[PDB]
Structures are given as C-alpha cells and as structure tokens.
Write a protein that binds this ligand. Structure first.
Ligand SMILES: [Mg+2]
Ligand SMILES: [Mg+2]
Ligand SMILES: [Mg+2]
Ligand SMILES: [Mg+2]
Ligand SMILES: [Mg+2]
Ligand SMILES: [Mg+2]
Lengths: 49, 58, 182, 137, 350, 161, 133, 183, 40, 48
RNA sequence: GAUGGGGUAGCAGAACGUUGAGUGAAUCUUAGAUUUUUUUUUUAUAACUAAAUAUAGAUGAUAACUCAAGUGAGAAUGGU
C-alpha cells in the first residue's frame, strides 16, 4: 500500500487524495496509518529458536 | 575509388583512386608503421600555430 | 489535472452473466442519472448497485475532492448568462454540461470472486452434480465532466486534422518495374 | 500576388556531394573472467588495433564488463543502436561481426520489396488518359 | 571512491569552468572521429574543431565560443547560396527567394546537417564534459549573434497593431531571411518552445562555425567546396514554396507587361461533367501559344490551376541545372565571364 | 498467389510500345512524347528570354483552337464625375443604394463599385452578422461540407490540389 | 572506337538540354531505372566493397529524357554518358522461417534465411558533349 | 521508383467512354472484307471489350485490388448484333434454391421484358472477376436501347469533339502539336 | 453490501461529505499519504 | 580500465554535477543507501 | 572460379536445452545481482540491447570446461 501511495503523491501533485478520511481496509479491518493490536504489542508467539 | 580498409592477412590498405591510375598496404607493430594519423601527429599539428593561408587564397 | 476514483464493490451474491447487464446500464451515465435507474429497476442486484454507488460517491467527494465546484459553476451560468459547453460522447449522445465538476460513471466492469457455496443436484439414476453458487463484484471508475470536455475536444481536433475530401486523390501506384509503361 | 510558404525545408541525400559513414561509435565489451570472452580478448589484441586504425571516423570504446557475455554495440547517426553478442566466437569471427556493424545502417531490417527509392518526380510524368492520342472503345 | 577511480584524469578546478580546456580536445575520441567523419583537412587542428562545438551560451568569453566562427560562416553560406539561387532561377519572386534561402541555410536545415554528422549535445555546459559534444545553455534567453539587418522604428506597432511591413525594405532593414531583427538554476521542468529554438540555434551556429574554421585554415576555395557538398547538395522542390492570391489576375498583368496578347482559357478536354468527380482540362492560350495547363474537378478551379502552372513556368525558368556562378571568377584563371540574365521583377497586380 | 515472385508475374504490365523497338545495329535517338502531364520546369518558348540560346524548333520539326472557356472583356463606362456620385449615394442611403443597385445604374461590375466606395462600418458589420447568423442554422453535416469548400479553395492556391 | 552515328550526334544535345534525365543501368545483367540521387538496394551482397566506395556504371540500356530516348543496340556507348554510384553499406532482412512439412508426418523441417543487400546511391548522371567526338 | 513519383490524380479518374452496339467495328468484327460486310461487335466480343474497360486493364497503372475502372455508355442496345440463332434459341436459367422453381427465358423474350441492355449486362457480368468489386464495376456499364442517354455531357471530349465523333482525331492531334513548343 | 451494519468509519465519511458539499470546509490535498523528501 | 556505470555516463554528458545538487538539496542519498536501515516490520514479528 | 541439396520405415553423424554436481572458501551485484513482461540486435530450438516495476549483499545469480540423469509432450476414449 505504501508502494502505491507514494506513486500517487508523485503523480497527482495538488490532487493527492486524503487517505486519512477513507474507509477501513476490509482485508484486515484497519484504518489508514494505524497498526493492529496484535502487531503493535508484538504478542504473537515466536519459535524457540 | 576505394576507401581505407584493413585486410586481416595482408595489412591496412590505403585509399586508391583508379581514375588517376597503387594499392599500398603498410603493415607493422606500431601505429606509425600503419600509415595512419596517431595522437602524436595531432600534437604536432596542434602546435603549428604559425601556419597561415596566403592572403590571396583567404 | 483530472480527478479520478476507482472503486471496487463488495462481493455481491450473483453471477457475471447477470450483473454484466447492470454495469452496461450505468456506464457513461452520471451518478445522479445512474442512481435513478437503480432505484426503479426490477433486478434484485440493482439495490446493491445503488448502495455501492453511494459509497463510491462519498469516497470521491471526501477522499478525491470531486463534485465540489457546483456553487461556483452555477454563478457563471446565471450571474453572467454564460453559454454552457456542448459536447458529444464517444457513443454519440449530445450533452450540455453546465457544471464541469459533476461526477459520472466513466468506466465499469464486473469480475468474478470466490465460490459462495456448493449445491448438489440429485438427478435420476443416482446421479449427482455440483452446482457452484457464484459471488461477483463490480468496479466503477468515477470521473468529473472535465474529462468528457477534454476527450470531445480531442476527437474534434482529430477530425479537423485529417484534411478535407478531395475529388481526385493522388493514390499511390504500388508496383515498381524497371521500365516505363507510358 | 505570390506569397511564399515558410514550412518546407531542403532534404538531404547522403552520398550525393558528401558521404558520411552512418556508424559513429562502437562499444567493445569484454570480460577477463568469463570463459565466453576468450575470443573477444584475442580480437582486441590482434585485429581491433588495425581495424580501429582503418576506420578513423568511428569512436571505439573498450570497457570491461565482468559476469556478462561480450557484445559489440554500434551506435548510429540516426540514434538507433545495434548490439551483437559474440560469445564463444573466435577473433576472426569478431572482425567479421564488427564489419557487419560498420557497413550496416541504424535502420530496422525490412524485407526486400523494391530496388529503387526515389524522391524526384518522373522524368516522363505519370500517365493521363487526357494527354495522349485518345482511345476508342 | 577508492573502488571507482575517475575515468578521466581532471584537475579539481575542472567542474567549475564554463567549457573544457583547449588541451582537453587532444584526448577525446569523439572529436577525432568527428574530424575524420567530415573528411576535414589536417590543416584544421583538433583544438579548433573543439571551439566550434562551444556555443556562446555556455561561455560568455568571445574566445572559446562560436560567436566569431559562426559569423564568418553564416556570411559564406548565405553568399554562396544567394548567388547560386539567382543564377539557377533568375526570376524567383523576392518572398520566395527569402523562403528558399531559409530552406537551405536556415536554422531548420542546418539543424539536420548537424544531426547527420553524428553530433551529440551535452546535457548542461561544464568543464568536465568531453569536447566532442555540442554544449550550449538553453535556459539563457538573450543569446543571439550579430546581424547586418537594422531594427525597425515601428517594430512594436507591426506586432501589436498589425502594421504593414513590405517586401522591398526587407532586403536592407531585415536579416538575410527577411525576418525582423530584435523581434540558482532548477532543472525540474520540461521542454519549452523557447528552448527548442535555442536547440535549433546552437546546432545552426555550429554548422556555420565549421565553415568559419574551414575558411580560416583552408582558405576561401575550401569553404566553397564544403558548402557546395554538404549544404547545396540537399534537394528542395521550389515549386512547393508558391502560394497564389488571384493568379488569373496576376497572369493577365504578366501578358500585358510582356506585350503578349491577352490570355484565353480554353477547354482542352473534359469528362464526367454532371458527376461527383468530373475532370476538366483547361489550357490558357496567349494567341496560338499555350502558356500553361491545369486539370481540376471544378471548371473555375481548373482555370485557376491552369493560371498557376503558367505563372510557375514563368518564375521557375532555369537556364541550366549547374549554371556558372560569379564566384568562379575570383579563383584561379577561368574562362571569361558571360553576362547572366537579370529579370525585371515579379508582376504587381490588383 | 503463393509467393511474391508469382504475384509479380500476374500483376505484370509490359513497357510502352516505343521502348520495344530496340535497334539491332548501333544507337538511335527516338522521339517518344509521353501521354502525361508536363511539369512546370518545361518552360514554353514564349517565356524564354531572347538571350537564351536553347529556343529550338519543335522536336517534331527536328526529325483550329479548342473551345473558349473564359474570354473576358474590360469596359470603362464610369467617368470620373460618376465616381463621385457613387460615393455620395453609398454614404447617404447604404440600404437603398447597394452595390447591385449602383452596378446596374452605371453599367459596371459589382467589384468596381466597391473599389471606389465603401459602406459605413455600421453597415459592414451588419452584413457580417447576417451571414454569421446564417452560419448558425447549419447542422453538423452542412457546416462540415461548407468548411471543406473553404479548405479545398485554400489548398488549391497552395499547390495541394 | 566505332564512330557514333551522325543522327545520334545531332540530337544528343537536344537530349542533354531538357530538364530531367533518367537511365536504365545494368548490374550483372539486371536493369534498374534510376535517376541522380536514387538509392538502389541490390538483391545481393556485392563482394569487395566498403561504404564510401565509388562505382562507375558503364552498361546502360536506355538513357532518355521526357520526349527523347537514346537506345543502344546491346548497350549505349560509354563515351556518351557518365554514371557513377557510391556504396552506402549493406542492409539485411528480418529472419524468415520456412517450415517444410507433409501431411500426417510430425517431422517439421525448418529453414532460416536472412540475406544481406548492398545499397547504392546514384550521385552522378550526366550526358557528355560529343561535339569533339 | 521515379516512374511512379508524381501526381497520379488523372490516372485514377473515371473516364466516360461511349460505343454504339450498331456501328460496324472493324477491330471487333470477324468479317473484315468487303468494307460493306463489316459487322458490329457481337454480344460476347463487345462484352469482352467492355469488361476490360470496367477493370481498368487498359491503363498502365492497373491493379486488380485498386478499383481503377472507367465508365462505359452503350447505346443502341436494341440492335444488339448476334450470330446464328442465339436470339430465339439461347436460354437463360435461374433458380431460387426451391425444387421446381426453375425459370427459363430466351434471349428474344428477355429482350422484350428488360430490353437488350439486360442481355448485355448478363454477358459483361460473367466476364468480370468474381469478387467484391464485381457489382461496383458492373454498375459502371450504362446500357440504353436508343440513341438517348443522360451522359451526353460526361463523354470524354478532346477540343470539343466527343471521342467517336466524326472529327475527334483531328482535334486530338491539333492539341499535341501545341504541346511540343516548350523545353 | 446493503445489509452490512455501518461502522464508525463509514459514519465519519458521511459527516465529512455533508460538510464539503454544504461549503463549511474546503477540500485540500492530503499531506500524510507518504513521507517523501521532495515535498512537491 | 573499469566498467562504465550509469554514473560515469552522466559525468561525461555533464548531467551528474546537477544531480548532486538536486539530491543534496532534497536530502536524498547520492551514491548510497543513506543512514536508513533494512525493513524490520516482518523481522520483528518473528518471520523466518 | 571444387562437388553435392525431396523423403516415410530405417540407419548414421553433430548440437542445443532442462535438472543436479565439481572447479567454487572462485567471479560479479544500491555505480542495481535478480525481476515469468515488453523491446532491440545476432544465421537464432538460443542468447543479447534497452525500457518499465519491485528491491537484494547471500538460503542470490553466474561464464567456461566437465560429470550424472526422475532431461524435452497438440496426441495413449491417458491421469490430476
Ligand atoms: Mg437412488
Ligand atoms: Mg476466379
Ligand atoms: Mg533436389
Ligand atoms: Mg535431406
Ligand atoms: Mg524483468
Ligand atoms: Mg492428454
């Protein structure tokens, strides 16, 4: 999403979208510029190695 | 009229105009032997700052 | 210079051969014209296309800024008695654009998604057949009327650039022969 | 009243009055490590020195290019470029390939259709059914 | 860094100079090939050909720049074509003459002669660039050469208020092509119609400079052969530079001036009248003599086209394809000069 | 056909009869006037200067007229005094004394009445508007054929037709 | 050499005086109707020629202007005209593959053909003055 | 290539030729003596000449793909010349793919319903290449029964004399003599 | 899609839509889409 | 003696000296990868 | 100014490509190694030039010669 958001800010210029006012991403359910509790607290179990 | 060419087994044959006729082929291990204009020749032509064409021809 | 919004709808419980006809109906129409056709259609998926077209319009107005120039355009037409722009779409329909910021449905295509489910068809002779329940989506590309006023000026310039029709054209002779035939 | 047009210029015909070799540069890429560059290395030491002296109107640039096959890249006056991979070729095969780039032009290859290409009008003009003796059906 | 040593040994004070040094031209492979491509004589050193490639926009100094060579070259190119055009077509109208001088020695054709020599331009002028590249500054607005034409007192009115200029004063007041005289940095931009002009100007000045160097080193006769081989060898259809307004009226003034009997349009042949694409062939006859013939779809257009073909035949009269030039006399002893034809002028009519 | 060589044979056209009379012995220069349109570089003998030495006899001599189409006649029926009346009437009542009324009164060509006199600006601008209002009643199909007539005329005078 | 006919000696100036001239040169027996400036692309690779070489063409079947045509019985005499060309290098074609195959037979045999062609430029075509001859 | 470079406007123009089916044709007649026995061009020999004109195969720029044909106005087709007993014994057939719907008609009866022009078109039709240019070319064959037709102004002229008229050849030669008086 | 309960993110995009259309706020290009060093 | 890199070509043309100014004025990395480090979002989650 | 030129069954010669292996603790890579694409060129089942997108310092790719085969598919009412 950052690979495509940077190409639009380069191309659109003064027409750059306001992505902060957009709806959530239904894949993960996150807002723009926000992590998920599982990824912000790093609570995912890791292997012993 | 033929233009300068490099023959692999003979050498560098110079330009010849059969209208005024001379296939001179110069071979060697140095650029001077080949008969072409080398870098040193361009330095001798660049230092000749006195050469000037006659006023009548200018 | 030209704003654009690509919106992909949610997974609709229908097929591509059914919804394809609902995307060809709203193609080229303005969002207001396209919503009036979904409100009065008899198709069950026209109610879903009316909800997804209201979401895309909200994204265009908020995220992309489209459709936000009305008040300013209404002045020139009335306050100054200006002559609006008259264009002709690629299909040939003549339009009269008074507000160049009006949103419309530039492009639209339907794709097929995952398999909703699987039904079993129990025929005679103990035969069973699998019936795949389809889900499908639609994409709408929303643009402002400035895109149609630019595309019309290009088609008009390409028509005035091909030159006029001459009575006796200088057609080429495409056979070369090493002699004269006349 | 005669008004002169100012949107037509003279067209050049290379070969008439003066000739200009279309090949203006030749890039010679070799590799000291690649085994496929064994012949290209022998061409640069025995055949290139004299071939480069026979064509003083061509810019020869010899640069290494490890981990890559050897190529002969000729740049032409029309802006196009032709590259030839000379992997596993003997020194005398490279000299035959460098003569292909020198005699060639930057244009794209095209099938043989018509020998003559002329931009000058017919000495005897194109036929007309109105400038002859007539015809009776 | 240590892994990438510089390819070209240069002093530290080399990226700041306006143009490469003279001694730099003695180690570049582009010049040595460019010198050998044009078959220039060994009289012209490589330090001189390099100066021809440095435009006055990249270097303000009078030396190291094309300003002086490009002047001496423009005078020779213009003079040799002017005399050759008047000897070949002695009756060309003056406006067409300006168009034909501009069609050979103008910025447009001279830009193609430089691109046919394999001359690559430098991105931005600097002392680091190799002298074999044409280097100029396309963002500098005020760069121009010195010309013999003078500025018109009414120049502002002509442009703003569409005043009339004329075609008899252009010879003295205007330039050799009839045109009026005097008509940090950020590289985040695109091309401009003004920069394209500077690109055309830089190429033209270079081709003119090469002729200025040939004249200085090799003499006059060498320059004439270079112009005759590279410039005059180009082909142009002068019949396509003609634009007629009321040709039938002009043709009538011609016959009246030359005392020829009045012209009469006669229908030589025709077919397909009352059709979509008829053909009418009308011939304009002065007495029994046939001046010109034209075929068109409309009867009126056929009469107009026939009148143009008769006028083109009058103006495009050529004594010969390779006529003698007055410049052939000042050289080594040649045959005595024979007076060349001098036409009265193009007909002025209603 | 199958191959390009087979196509060249089916599309063959033989050269002109004149070229097929090859001389068996020696070289001969023959007269072969072609059935084509001559260019403008074949200056007619009437346009050659007397100085030019190439004015030979017809090549035919080295081995009625067609129907009239446009033969105009110029007439001068308006005296200097009558040119002042034209300038008075035109400037007095430009709607009654048009160039057609004055042309018929003085037996002149309509163009001449405009050469000696010009209507007031108000009247001139009124004429361009009438024709401008007439150019708005044309549909897209007639307005495109009316523009082609104006381009074919400018092309004709540029040597493009 | 054989003296030229008197009829060709009196009409050659009338032929050289006209505006344009063409010729039919014969390279190895094949004709090519050309004019000064034309670009002949021969269907073969002339051996032993490099770009810049000048060729003098001496086998011309026809030399004519608009109205006049000079024909030689086998060929026109070389003394009358002077035609010269210049070798502009050689060009090639895009590789074309011919697939020789028979029905109900899987073996498809390929033939790869990519020929080279020499390109010329007629830079001189003039008719000589034979008043002295 | 120079032979084709130029203005080919008039080489592609459509010329309106004219021939009368009643005038004796010395070239297209099989009886060449005596002068009074010379007959007009027969149906199939007049049709083979017309088909050549419709295809433009008489021009030096002919190309089968390019439609460079000309017009041919045939008058006096009521007096179409035929040999033997074709007129009353030649049959023209026709079928519409329905068994039993076979139509037969003789030349004399087809010359009564649709005149002699229909018999000429059926002959010229079978002599043209069977392709998408067939109906364009055949439509340029304008055949009439009498001496009247609407193309009396389209017929190609030379100095005011229609080709085929009494003195057109002298008018053509008088214009070529005026052409040679130039460089 | 017509039956999904509108979430908090869909209710805030409808209040902004009525604020831009009404004219209260003026739309401006986004400034946090990506942190580029060019800033153009 | 060494391989000609896209950097070497630009220096010959003269464009490089201008690129160093623009990249330096924008705080971008001339001939390097800067002080920024490798992507660690997936590495921090325990990716293997 | 060498001779020769269709081909089934069939016989024979010479090569390319795929996978793995040795030389290899080798060579090359943010000055872009690698990117199923597009493009260019070269007598070309192959490689190469350039372009566009992404971003790797080796669990990456790789010339040349060699070694071993689970090595080449429009055809089996073939199988998934
Ligand atoms: Mg059961
Ligand atoms: Mg057939
Ligand atoms: Mg055989
Ligand atoms: Mg065999
Ligand atoms: Mg890739
Ligand atoms: Mg299978």
């Amino acid at each position: 999403a950052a690979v495509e958001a940077r190409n639009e800010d380069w191309m659109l210029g003064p027409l750059a979208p306001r992505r902060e006012l957009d709806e959530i991403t239904l894949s993960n359910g996150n807002f723009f510029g926000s992590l998920s509790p599982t990824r912000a607290l790093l609570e995912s179990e890791v292997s012993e190695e | 009229k033929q233009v300068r060419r490099f023959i692999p087994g003979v050498g560098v044959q110079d330009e010849v105009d059969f209208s005024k006729v001379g296939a001179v082929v110069r071979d060697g291990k140095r650029a001077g032997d080949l008969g072409v204009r080398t870098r040193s020749d361009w330095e001798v032509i660049g230092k000749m700052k006195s050469v000037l064409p006659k006023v009548k021809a200018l | 210079t030209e704003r654009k919004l690509v919106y992909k709808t949610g997974y609709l419980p229908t097929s591509v051969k059914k919804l394809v006809h609902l995307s060809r109906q709203i193609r080229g129409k303005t969002v207001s014209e396209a919503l009036v056709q979904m409100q009065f259609s008899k198709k069950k998926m026209a109610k879903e296309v009316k909800t997804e077209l209201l979401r895309a319009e909200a994204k265009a107005i908020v995220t992309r800024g489209m459709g936000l120039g009305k008040a300013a355009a209404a002045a020139a037409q009335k306050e100054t008695g200006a002559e609006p722009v008259k264009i002709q779409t690629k299909d040939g329909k003549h339009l009269e654009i008074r507000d160049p910021t009006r949103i419309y449905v530039a492009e639209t295509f339907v794709n097929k998604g995952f398999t909703r489910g699987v039904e079993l068809d129990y025929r005679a002779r103990g035969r069973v057949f699998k019936m795949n329940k389809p889900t499908t989506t639609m994409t709408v590309v929303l643009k402002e009327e400035k895109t149609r006023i630019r595309e019309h000026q290009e088609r008009v310039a390409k028509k005035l650039r091909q030159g006029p029709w001459v009575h006796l054209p200088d057609r080429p002779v495409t056979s070369q022969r090493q002699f004269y035939s006349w | 009243t005669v008004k002169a047009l100012t949107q037509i210029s003279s067209a050049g015909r290379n070969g008439v009055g003066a000739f200009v070799l279309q090949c203006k540069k030749l890039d010679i890429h070799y590799s000291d490590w690649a085994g496929s560059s064994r012949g290209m290395n022998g061409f640069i030491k025995s055949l290139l020195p004299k071939f480069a002296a026979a064509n003083p109107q061509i810019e020869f640039v010899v640069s290494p290019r490890p981990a890559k096959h050897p190529i002969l890249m000729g740049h032409y006056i029309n802006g196009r470029t032709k590259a030839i991979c000379v992997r596993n070729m003997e020194p005398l095969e490279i000299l035959k390939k460098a003569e292909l780039l020198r005699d060639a032009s930057g244009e794209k290859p095209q099938k043989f259709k018509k020998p003559v290409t002329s931009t000058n009008p017919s000495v005897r003009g194109v036929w007309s059914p109105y400038h002859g003796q007539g015809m009776a059906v | 860094n240590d892994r990438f040593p510089p390819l070209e040994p240069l002093p530290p004070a080399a990226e700041s100079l306006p143009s490469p040094l003279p001694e730099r031209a003695l180690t570049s492979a582009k010049l040595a090939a460019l010198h050998a491509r044009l078959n220039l004589s060994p009289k012209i050193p490589l330090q001189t050909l390099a100066r021809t490639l440095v435009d006055a926009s990249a270097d303000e100094n009078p030396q190291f720049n094309n300003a002086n060579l490009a002047f001496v070259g423009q005078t020779l190119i213009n003079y040799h074509i002017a005399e050759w055009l008047l000897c070949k077509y002695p009756r060309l109208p003056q406006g067409i003459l300006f168009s034909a001088m501009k069609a050979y020695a103008g910025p447009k054709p001279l830009l193609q002669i430089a691109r046919s020599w394999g001359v690559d331009t430098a991105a931005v002028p600097g002392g680091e660039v190799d002298p074999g590249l044409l280097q100029f500054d396309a963002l500098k607005p005020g760069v121009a050469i010195t010309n013999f034409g003078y500025k018109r007192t009414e120049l502002a009115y002509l442009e703003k208020f569409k005043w009339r200029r004329g075609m008899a004063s252009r010879v003295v007041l205007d330039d050799d092509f009839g045109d009026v005289v005097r008509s940090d940095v950020s590289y985040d931009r695109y091309g401009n119609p003004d920069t394209r002009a500077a690109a055309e100007r830089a190429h033209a000045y270079f081709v003119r400079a090469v002729v200025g160097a040939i004249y200085a080193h090799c003499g006059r006769e060498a320059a004439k052969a270079f112009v005759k081989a590279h410039i005059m060898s180009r082909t142009l259809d002068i019949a396509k530079l003609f634009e007629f307004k009321y040709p039938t009226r002009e043709l009538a003034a011609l016959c009246a001036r030359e005392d020829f009997e009045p012209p009469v349009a006669r229908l030589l042949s025709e077919t397909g009248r009352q059709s979509r694409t008829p053909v009418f062939v009308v011939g304009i006859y002065s007495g029994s003599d046939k001046l010109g013939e034209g075929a068109a779809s409309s009867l009126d257009h056929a009469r107009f086209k026939a009148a143009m073909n008769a006028l083109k035949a009058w103006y495009l009269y050529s004594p010969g394809e390779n006529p003698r030039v007055p410049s052939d006399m000042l050289e080594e002893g040649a045959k005595p000069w024979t007076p060349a034809y001098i036409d009265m002028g193009e007909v002025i009519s209603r | 056909q199958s191959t390009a060589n087979r196509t060249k044979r089916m599309l063959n056209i033989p050269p002109h009869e004149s070229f097929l009379n090859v001389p068996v012995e020696g070289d001969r220069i023959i007269f072969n006037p072609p059935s084509s349109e001559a260019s403008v570089y074949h200056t007619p003998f009437k346009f050659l200067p007397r100085s030019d030495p190439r004015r030979r006899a017809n090549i035919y001599k080295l081995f009625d007229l067609p129907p009239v189409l446009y033969n105009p006649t110029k007439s001068y029926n308006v005296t200097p005094e009558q040119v002042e009346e034209i300038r008075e009437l035109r400037a007095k009542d430009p709607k009654k004394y048009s160039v057609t009324y004055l042309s018929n009164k003085y037996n002149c060509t309509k163009v001449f009445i405009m050469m000696c006199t010009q209507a007031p600006r108000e009247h001139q601008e009124q004429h361009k508007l009438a024709r401008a209002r007439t150019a708005e009643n044309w549909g897209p199909r007639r307005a495109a054929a009316k523009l082609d007539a104006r381009r074919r005329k400018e092309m004709l005078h540029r040597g493009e037709i | 050499q054989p003296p030229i006919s008197q009829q060709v000696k009196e009409l050659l100036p009338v032929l050289a005086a006209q505006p344009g001239h063409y010729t039919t040169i014969h390279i190895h027996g094949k004709p090519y109707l050309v004019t000064e400036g034309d670009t002949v692309k021969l269907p073969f690779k002339m051996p032993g020629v490099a770009p810049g070489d000048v060729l003098r063409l001496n086998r011309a079947s026809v030399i004519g202007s608009r109205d006049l045509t000079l024909q030689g019985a086998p060929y026109v005499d070389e003394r009358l005209f002077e035609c010269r060309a210049i070798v502009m290098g050689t060009e090639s074609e895009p590789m074309r593959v011919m697939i020789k195959k028979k029905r109900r037979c899987r073996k498809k045999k390929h033939v790869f053909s990519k020929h080279k062609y020499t390109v010329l430029r007629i830079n001189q075509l003039k008719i000589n003055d034979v008043s002295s001859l | 290539m120079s032979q084709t470079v130029g203005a080919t406007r008039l080489a592609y123009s459509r010329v309106w030729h004219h021939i009368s089916a009643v005038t004796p044709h010395p070239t297209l007649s099989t009886i060449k003596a005596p002068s009074e026995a010379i007959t007009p061009p027969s149906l199939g020999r007049l049709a083979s000449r017309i088909a050549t004109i419709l295809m433009g195969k008489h021009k030096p720029i002919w190309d089968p793909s390019t439609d460079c044909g000309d017009y041919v106005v045939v008058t006096n087709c009521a007096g179409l010349y035929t040999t033997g007993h074709k007129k009353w014994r030649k049959t023209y057939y026709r079928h519409n793919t329905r068994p039993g719907s076979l139509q037969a008609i003789t030349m004399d009866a087809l010359m009564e319903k649709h005149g002699g022009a229909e018999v000429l078109r059926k002959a010229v039709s079978g002599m043209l290449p069977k392709n998408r240019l067939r109906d364009k070319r055949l439509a340029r064959l304008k055949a009439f029964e009498g001496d009247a037709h609407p193309y009396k102004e389209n017929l190609v002229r030379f100095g005011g004399k229609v080709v085929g008229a009494p003195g057109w050849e002298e008018a053509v030669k008088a214009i070529r003599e005026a052409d040679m008086e130039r460089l | 899609p017509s039956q999904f309960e509108v979430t908090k993110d869909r209710k805030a995009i409808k209040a902004r839509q009525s604020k831009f259309l009404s004219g209260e706020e003026t739309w401006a290009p986004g400034k946090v889409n990506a942190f580029l060093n060019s800033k153009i | 003696p060494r391989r000609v890199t896209p950097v070497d070509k630009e220096r010959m043309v003269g464009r490089w000296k201008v690129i160093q100014k623009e990249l330096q004025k924008r705080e971008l990395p001339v001939l390097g990868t800067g002080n920024h480090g490798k992507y660690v979002e997936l590495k921090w989650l325990g990716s293997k």
